[PDB]
Design a protein around this ligand. Sequence first.
Ligand SMILES: O=C(NCCCN1CCCC1=O)c1cnc(NCCc2ccncc2)nc1NC1CCCC1
Length: 224
Amino acid sequence: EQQFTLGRMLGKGSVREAQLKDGSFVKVAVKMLFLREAACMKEFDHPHVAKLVGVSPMVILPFMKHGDLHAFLLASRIPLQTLVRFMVDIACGMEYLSSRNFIHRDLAARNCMLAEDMTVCVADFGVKWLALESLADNLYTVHSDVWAFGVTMWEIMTRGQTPYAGIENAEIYNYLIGGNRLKQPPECMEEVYDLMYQCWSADPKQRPSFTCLRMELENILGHL
Ligand SMILES: O=C(NCCCN1CCCC1=O)c1cnc(NCCc2ccncc2)nc1NC1CCCC1
């Protein structure tokens, strides 16, 4: 298939803007690099998960003008209420995906997209976001998805900072095993950091579910 016109580069892994064609012309985004798993991912539908437009190899996703969450956070830096709502949005998307038995593996702010209405959707159906057992055993589960969510929470709170900035990738395992984590940002709400810290328990069963996270973030959102 080639009913779309490859255009300007959006990010570089390569993502490029394109123009998909019954009526007129729709602007999409094409990830340039399978069909069995894309048949499973096509069925997903939720206001906080980025839809699959299709596949062709390359992946066809909706074009989203406000770009990715990570750049947005960075752009602002160079209100807690808005930050907490971003987290709620990601949690809704993730709660949905894990309810469909989908393990994401690559959750990060860069993989979260700002929609037209400035809601955040989880994108990208598929070491600094990886749980200890993802690192030690290549075990990927809902619980390692929650670990990655917790790092994403930290990214939101620090407004786009690189996690473990003073530490090399090769030293991350060693850092974490020693019981060290990402430190509480200055002016970060205790309640926010507590929930985030819970996401990084060495014991994967001691990590909250996405339902639990959504509820406990939604609770915080009501105590504005
Ligand atoms: O770049 C984009 N839009 C314009 C942003 C430019 N902005 C934003 C504020 C100021 C300004 O000038 C963009 C638009 N649509 C898509 N569609 C999702 C596709 C996708 C699929 C799977 N994984 C990951 C992304 N991705 C985009 N970017 C990707 C390439 C790098 C990060 C994500």
